[PDB]
Amino acid sequence: HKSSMVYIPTTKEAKRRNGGILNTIEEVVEKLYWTYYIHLPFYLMASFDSFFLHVFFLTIFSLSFFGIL
Amino acid sequence: ILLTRKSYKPPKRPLTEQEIDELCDEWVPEPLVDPSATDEQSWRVAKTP
Amino acid sequence: TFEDENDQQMLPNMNATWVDQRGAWLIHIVVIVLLRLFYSLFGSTPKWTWTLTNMTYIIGFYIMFHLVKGTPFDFNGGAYDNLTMWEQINDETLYTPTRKFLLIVPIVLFLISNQYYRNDMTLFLSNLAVTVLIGVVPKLGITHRLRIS
Numbered sequence: 195h196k197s198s199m200v201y202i203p204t205t206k207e208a209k210r211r212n213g214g215i216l217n218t219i220e221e222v223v224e225k226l227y228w229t230y231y232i233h234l235p236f237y238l239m240a241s242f243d244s245f246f247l248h249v250f251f252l253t254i255f256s257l258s259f260f261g262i263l
Numbered sequence: 264i265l266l267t268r269k270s271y272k273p274p275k276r277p278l279t280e281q282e283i284d285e286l287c288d289e290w291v292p293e294p295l296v297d298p299s300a301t302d303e304q305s306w307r308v309a310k311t312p
Numbered sequence: 313t314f315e316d317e318n319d320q321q322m323l324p325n326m327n328a329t330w331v332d333q334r335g336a337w338l339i340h341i342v343v344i345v346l347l348r349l350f351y352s353l354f355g356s357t358p359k360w361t362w363t364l365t366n367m368t369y370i371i372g373f374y375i376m377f378h379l380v381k382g383t384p385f386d387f388n389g390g391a392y393d394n395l396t397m398w399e400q401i402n403d404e405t406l407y408t409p410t411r412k413f414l415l416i417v418p419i420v421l422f423l424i425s426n427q428y429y430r431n432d433m434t435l436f437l438s439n440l441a442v443t444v445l446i447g448v449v450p451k452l453g454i455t456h457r458l459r460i461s
């Protein structure tokens with residue numbers, strides 16, 4: 195049986211097709227990026243509001259890290 | 264004192280004179296006696312010496 | 313009236329049903345704690361941080377639960393057009409567990425904050441005034457549906 199549906203390869207298969215630990219570093223960075231991004235409402239905001247929330251969080255983290263030391 | 268309360272529902276408004284009058288006019292009573300079965304029992308009166 | 317009550321009963325009010333769900337009692341405490349740590353991160357003296365925490369929480373709660381009348385979306389003809397969100401909780405039934413918990417929170421918050429600005433009469437008086445005048449009075453059982461000018 196055959197139809198007119200074009201399929202989309204899985205990301206694992208795409209990495210298999212395209213072929214050290216630089217990949218591991220990249221994937222841990224992207225894991226952290228997604229984990230931070232999806233749990234805060236950035237998809238539901240505009241650009242200016244998202245930028246201001248970003249700088250707000252960055253300032254909080256920087257101040258907290260400075261105080262901790 | 265605040266933690267002791269019981270959880271009541273806000274009190275309602277009392278009825279109005281026009282409402283009372285309409286409710287009273289809606290009520291219908293029964294007759295003093297029951298005239299339904301008088302005729303099939305009234306042979307007792309007719310057979311009394 | 314009759315139609316009004318039937319409309320108010322015909323649907324669960326999605327504007328005021330989320331309170332009795334899984335984790336609101338805890339989110340109140342969580343946001344209090346977060347505000348405390350934020351004001352600590354500012355860096356000023358503890359009394360200023362605690363009075364700022366108390367004012368911020370109380371004013372936010374008042375502006376959200378007590379200022380706006382109606383629903384943010386269509387519910388019925390009007391139904392709840394002249395009621396704030398605090399007057400809609402548990403379909404107008406006073407002193408339910410949720411209301412008790414929301415009443416207790418400001419008092420305990422003041423009790424915890426008390427032992428840091430006790431030495432200053434100005435801050436103590438202002439904190440007590442704001443607390444008892446904004447966080448306990450509108451939530452009372454005699455202020456329900458009390459409209460003034």
Ligand SMILES: CCCCCCCCCCCCC/C=C/[C@@H](O)[C@H](CO)NC(=O)CCCCCCCCCCCCCCCCCCCCCCC
Pocket residue numbers: 326327328330339340343347368369372373375376377380382383384397
């Ligand atoms: C009106 C124009 C005023 C102009 C001044 C600007 C004020 C704008 C900010 C306040 C607007 C609030 C208006 C009313 C909002 C709500 O009631 C709406 C409409 O009913 N509810 C709904 O949509 C239904 C409920 C939706 C979900 C509500 C729960 C979401 C999570 C809240 C959990 C409880 C939070 C803790 C209690 C409040 C603490 C406040 C924290 C204060 C610090 C942050 C804010 C500075």
